[PDB]
Scaffold this motif. Structure first.
Motif, PDB file in Angstrom:
ATOM      1  N   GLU A 182       0.826  -1.205   0.000  1.00 45.46           N
ATOM      2  CA  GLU A 182       0.000   0.000   0.000  1.00 45.46           C
ATOM      3  C   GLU A 182       0.865   1.262   0.000  1.00 45.46           C
ATOM      4  N   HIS A 209      -4.023  -0.006  -6.606  1.00 46.77           N
ATOM      5  CA  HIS A 209      -4.029  -0.859  -5.425  1.00 46.77           C
ATOM      6  C   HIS A 209      -5.250  -1.795  -5.420  1.00 46.77           C
ATOM      7  N   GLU A 223      -7.673  -2.189  -3.533  1.00 41.44           N
ATOM      8  CA  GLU A 223      -8.922  -1.479  -3.288  1.00 41.44           C
ATOM      9  C   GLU A 223      -9.514  -0.915  -4.574  1.00 41.44           C
ATOM     10  N   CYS A 253      -4.273   2.372   2.608  1.00 47.07           N
ATOM     11  CA  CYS A 253      -3.534   3.617   2.721  1.00 47.07           C
ATOM     12  C   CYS A 253      -4.537   4.777   2.788  1.00 47.07           C
ATOM     13  N   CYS A 288      -6.446   5.223  -0.597  1.00 46.17           N
ATOM     14  CA  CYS A 288      -7.418   4.143  -0.781  1.00 46.17           C
ATOM     15  C   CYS A 288      -8.641   4.310   0.143  1.00 46.17           C
ATOM     16  N   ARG A 299     -11.023   6.630  -1.330  1.00 45.94           N
ATOM     17  CA  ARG A 299     -11.690   5.996  -2.445  1.00 45.94           C
ATOM     18  C   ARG A 299     -12.828   5.104  -1.964  1.00 45.94           C
TER      19      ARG A 299
HETATM   20 ZN   LIG Z   1      -3.852   2.048  -0.918  1.00 48.34          ZN
END
Ligand SMILES: [Zn+2]
Ligand SMILES: [Zn+2]
Ligand SMILES: [Zn+2]
Ligand SMILES: [Zn+2]
Lengths: 185, 190, 185, 179
Positions: free
Chosen positions: C21, C59, C61, C89, C92, C95
């Motif tokens: 991450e 990533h 995710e 992270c 992420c 998101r």
């Molecule tokens: Zn991430």
């Protein structure tokens, strides 16, 4: 004893070391940086130099580790032997580690001791590899104990006129000392 | 609280420390006893602050304290940060040292220097009076160490053996010296 | 469904199961998941799988909501469950928050092997906002690893294997469980 | 993943696994699947799930490509495998063909438990055209029912007397229809 140097508004040690003393090592971006240091050079001939100070930035482009070797201690004279000591909030990032390794490798007359408040991304294998290579480069790395925080406070933090420990100042130390020892050996 | 200390000497009386150890002497061309105390403060408008204080000393130095400083202590300067340097020397710089100082002050415009001397180094020499004046021309601030200054250097640079358990013992002619040299430097600079 | 050469669970979860991450670069990614949708009308969908990459640009995710679960039909209620090596992270997290906010009929449970940069304030703020978005985050306990192993890892030979716990499987969980809690609630 | 109160697979594959169209827009749907995507470059994808409805407006075949795998990563090569109770109808076969026609990076394998109205010449036409589109069709072997039972049905095997006989039966029918 301990003299002035760092001018801050924070009054309590715990608050200082937990916020103002923070040194971001995020692999990306240009966050803030903070770093206290001590330099002592000895030369076979009566030559002696011992200074002490600190450095900080709200949004520095380079990390504390970089700024130090770029403006604070640019060059070293062969005739002297330096004993540098750092006091940062956490261990260096993978990149910074490499930078320190390449520096120590170019300056044999430079000994470095880095005392950290805690470990940074210690669980990550990338960081662990960097810490080992760092120890192999001759750089001694240790965790800051209660006495260390008190030292930095009374010697780097400017007063005008008594140190006080906090929550888990002793448990945090012992914890990271164990982890740093497992990886380094 | 008053000060820490990085200098170590077996001298317990400041009157002796500032008479011998703090002194600067040139025995031969490339062999002179050097000693210099300093303080660095750098502000780079943007949260970036820098501060430190140390000293230099040699018994067989090939150059004077003034030269040694700008050649190893502050060789590089961050063009972004604004530097404010303060020196604590036993005597004002010589003709040659003054030039080096001027040339350096000429190169880096982001540097501001303050020299606090304990006494005037050969103020009678017309060549020396010329250096001091030109030093002020370069923007350098010169001042004679006041009694308070010696106490400042003593409690913030000289490492006390018993930690925070000692005051300051000034010498008999500590004021006459300051007063004496303040008048001189004045006439010279203005 | 996961085909791997590693035989020992401890080795699998400590290496092949890793999901990087790092705030920068394009490292490797790994992620197992479970999806269950219920619909008032006899409509039921329940799939299970995983995703991995040696050098993915996005990533785990991201990849999930870009190719595995692109859209959701309002008439259904999804119960997604993730199984990753560490917590997401900062980026992420955001998101995930923006996704859950657009899909009210989506409930997300993320079970992590350990915390990622938990000590950093940026990460802690992201985890809180994440918990506030309705995303339930918890630490993987011994039973979880065993579950993932016997259900996501294709058995070398149908009906010829077993799960073997490792030295600090419990101590590691109890550590991050306490940590995640402190920060979260 | 699948949960039923049926302890015997013979019943699960007789009722629950079945697909029935009661009315035009009301039919019992049920489909098991497996997805394997390889995108040459370390990128691997694998999963397995199922669908079921009692009042579905469309057949399992339609429901799959409209919600389960709506999008396809042009980079990854998809390998889909279905487990249905009966082969697709004339209409469903077309949808399948049209989708197989659009995405060239998709490869489908349908494992049916029996042939859905193999006697209809219209149905025999669909199966053949389905093979034309590159779709692989096969009759579920006794091993297949056991595979779906132990990998999809949340248990906790037991074949039925005609489990093998049915496979052979529909296997011959399907063969004569394609080649
Ligand atoms: Zn991430
Ligand atoms: Zn760094
Ligand atoms: Zn000189
Ligand atoms: Zn149909």
């Amino acid at each position: 004893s301990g003299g002035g140097m760092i001018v801050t508004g924070e009054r309590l040690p715990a608050n200082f070391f937990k916020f103002q003393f923070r040194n971001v090592e995020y692999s990306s971006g240009r966050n803030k940086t903070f770093l206290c240091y001590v330099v002592e050079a000895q030369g076979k001939g009566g030559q002696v130099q011992a200074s002490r100070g600190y450095l900080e930035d709200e949004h520095a482009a380079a990390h504390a580790e970089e700024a130090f070797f770029n403006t604070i201690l640019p060059a070293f004279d062969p005739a002297l032997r330096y004993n540098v000591t750092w006091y940062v909030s956490s261990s260096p990032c993978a990149a910074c580690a490499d930078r320190i390794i390449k520096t120590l490798s170019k300056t044999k007359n430079l000994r470095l001791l880095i005392l950290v408040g805690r470990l940074f991304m210690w669980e990550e294998p990338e960081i662990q590899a960097a810490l080992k290579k760092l120890k192999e480069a001759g750089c001694k790395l240790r965790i800051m104990k209660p006495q260390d925080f008190e030292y930095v406070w009374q010697n780097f933090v400017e007063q005008e006129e008594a140190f006080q420990p906090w929550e888990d100042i002793q448990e945090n130390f012992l914890y990271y000392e164990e982890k740093l020892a497992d990886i380094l050996k």
